Amino acid sequence: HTSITLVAYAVPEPGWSAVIPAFNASEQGRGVQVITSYGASADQSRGVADGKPADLVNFSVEPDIARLVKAGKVDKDWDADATKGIPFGSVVTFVVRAGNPKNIRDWDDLLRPGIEVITPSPLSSGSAKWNLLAPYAAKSDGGRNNQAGIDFVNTLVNEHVKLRPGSGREATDVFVQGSGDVLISYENEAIATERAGKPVQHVTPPQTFKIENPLAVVATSTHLGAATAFRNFQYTVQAQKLWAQAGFRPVDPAVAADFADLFPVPAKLWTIADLGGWGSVDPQLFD
Incomplete structure (x- = not known):
């Protein structure tokens, strides 16, 4: 037809x-x-x-x-x-290796010494945008203290992100092959990866973002x-x-x-409306 x-x-x-x-x-x-x-x-x-x-x-x-x-x-x-x-x-979640060997439970855990975070590039991926909105919203209490939201993302990106995969799927691939200690990803992508028999699990931080x-x-x-x-x-x-x-x-x-x-449900589900919509987040974007 x-x-x-x-x-x-x-x-x-x-x-x-x-x-x-x-x-x-x-x-x-x-x-x-x-x-x-x-x-x-x-x-x-x-x-x-x-x-x-x-x-x-x-x-x-x-x-x-x-x-x-x-x-x-x-x-x-x-x-x-x-x-x-x-x-x-979906919601933003931490994809983690089987058993959570490094005991990753919250956003502060991503700033621990030697922890490499896998997250894609905001130029090509929307996954990269959810993955950075959640820690910003969490560490800034939804735009109130805007500086420690930025300062957290600052320390997270500079000192714990080196790989820049193009998409969330590409981020999942390089993480499965063994790069990085925690992959910020969709909850649906963690569920799908787990179900494919890949030795990973996921923990959602107490504060996360609504995808x-x-x-x-x-x-x-x-x-x-x-x-x-x-x-x-x-x-x-x-x-x-x-x-x-x-x-x-x-x-x-x-x-x-x-x-x-x-x-x-997490302890706190941040939404794009909490930050004033995309009209106020899209022209303020981190980079």
Whole structure:
């Protein structure tokens, strides 16, 4: 039948590869084959902004959707929904080696002597932006003492980050091969890596950041019938259960309640709204 292409960021594949078969077994999804493309979130956003074929976008951070809106590739209606265009999300977590040999439990543990932190580059990855928003929000109490938030990230980046992988997936790879003592990553990526039999576990710091992964239909697509059907299917009860089962925190309040016992609330869940939204974080960015 028809073919649609999803240009997604680096780590959402475990959920997408579970939802697409369910989509293809539905009335509107039978026959519409979904091609997928995963990579560094910002790199993927730029690709579609300058010609890369796409019928749907699913990026790590909302700015990577706004770039496409600024370029006429994503209609502005994409977040006027009560959903705000966010079908799922995650939290920032510490990926750690099996047994937590170095006993990493909190953000102060990343500043201990000799601890190397694995985290991607904010130029190409949205994972890198979540990974730095959480310690900033934690050490600054959500923008109140803005200086010790910066001063923490300062000491974390300069003295404990040397590798600069392009994406969260690339950060997971080099960490699995043996580089670094703690990898800051999505909770879904830690769950997916653990399940692949890799000898790692994860501890979420008491204060962490709420990851919200946006999804939007590409306006310049010749398949907005199927593309809209594939986007709306994500908010169904079944798809929300599937994302949850894949390790991604669903936005359906009933499914999120059903899976609340596997997606534990931290001591403090910082959100982009706590910092004044992306409108006040995106032009202030660390670098």
